[PDB]
Amino acid sequence: KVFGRCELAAAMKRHGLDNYRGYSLGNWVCAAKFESNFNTQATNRNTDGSTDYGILQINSRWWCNDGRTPGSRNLCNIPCSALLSSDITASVNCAKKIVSDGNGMNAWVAWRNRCKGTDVQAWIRGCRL
Which residue in 126, 120, 129, 99 sits closest to 30, CA to CA? 120
Full 3-state SS string of the chain: CECCHHHHHHHHHHCCCCCECCECHHHHHHHHHHHHCCECCCEEECCCCCEEECCCCEECCCCCECCCCCCCCCCCCCEHHHHHCCCCHHHHHHHHHHHCCCCHHHHCHHHHHHHCCCCHHHHCCCCCC
CATH number at residue 24: 1.10.530.10
87 catalytic, yes or no? no
Q: Kindly give, in sequence order, each residue whose CB lies less than 8 Å from that of residue 70, ignoring residues fewer than 6 positions away.
A: 49
Q: Is 21 within the bounds of a domain?
A: yes
What amino acid is encoded at 90 in this protein? Answer: A
Distance (Å, whole) CA 35 – CA 42:
9
Cα 12 to the center of its chain, rounded Å: 10
CA 114 to chain centre: 14
- C-alpha 94 chain-centroid distance: 8
**Residue 101 counted as an annotated binding residue:** yes
Single out the catalytic residue among 7, 18, 48, 52. Answer: 52
| 129 lies in some domain | no
Structural domain count of the chain: 1
Method of structure determination: X-ray
Identify whether 52 is a catalytic site residue. yes
The residues that bridge with 53 in the sheet, in sequence order, are 43, 58
The resolution of the experimental structure, rounded to one decimal in Å, is 2.2
